[PDB]
Amino acid sequence: NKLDSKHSGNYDYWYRSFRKSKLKPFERDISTEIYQAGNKPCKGKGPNC
Amino acid sequence: NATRFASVYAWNRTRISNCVADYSVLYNFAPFFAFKCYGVSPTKLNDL
Ligand SMILES: *[C@@H]1O[C@H](CO)[C@@H](O)[C@H](O)[C@H]1NC(C)=O
Numbered sequence: 849n850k851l852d853s854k855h856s857g858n859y860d861y862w863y864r865s866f867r868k869s870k871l872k873p874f875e876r877d878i879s880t881e882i883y884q885a886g887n888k889p890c891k892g893k894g895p896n897c
Numbered sequence: 898n899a900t901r902f903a904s905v906y907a908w909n910r911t912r913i914s915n916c917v918a919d920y921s922v923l924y925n926f927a928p929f930f931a932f933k934c935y936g937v938s939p940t941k942l943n944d945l
């Protein structure tokens with residue numbers, strides 16, 4: 849906490865709370881595209897996109 | 898899709914039991930501003 853706690857909030861560390869699937873152990877998924885909770889090629893950040 | 902909704906300080910508690918919970922029906926008319934599921938995966942709601 850001494851060197852990893854920004855006063856305004858350290859958003860550089862991202863913990864994934866919801867995803868399209870569950871990560872395979874020893875598999876580093878760096879998919880930065882939006883996760884889609886429905887079914888469509890989502891372009892903008894909206895509901896289920 | 899209730900005609901009238903209760904106030905926040907008087908939130909109404911509905912009991913759901915002895916039936917199959919189909920969340921696709923909810924998704925059919927869901928303009929989900931917030932869809933935050935805690936403790937249960939939203940994609941795993943159809944098999945639990
Ligand atoms: C919501 O839709 C249901 C199913 O058609 C209907 O019975 C109900 O009256 C509707 N509620 C409204 C329009 O407030």
Ligand SMILES: *[C@@H]1O[C@H](CO)[C@@H](O)[C@H](O)[C@H]1NC(C)=O
Nearest residue numbers: 899903907908909910911912
């Ligand atoms: C709303 O609240 C009233 C008063 O407690 C209750 O009789 C009624 O069943 C509630 N409706 C629903 C849909 O939960």
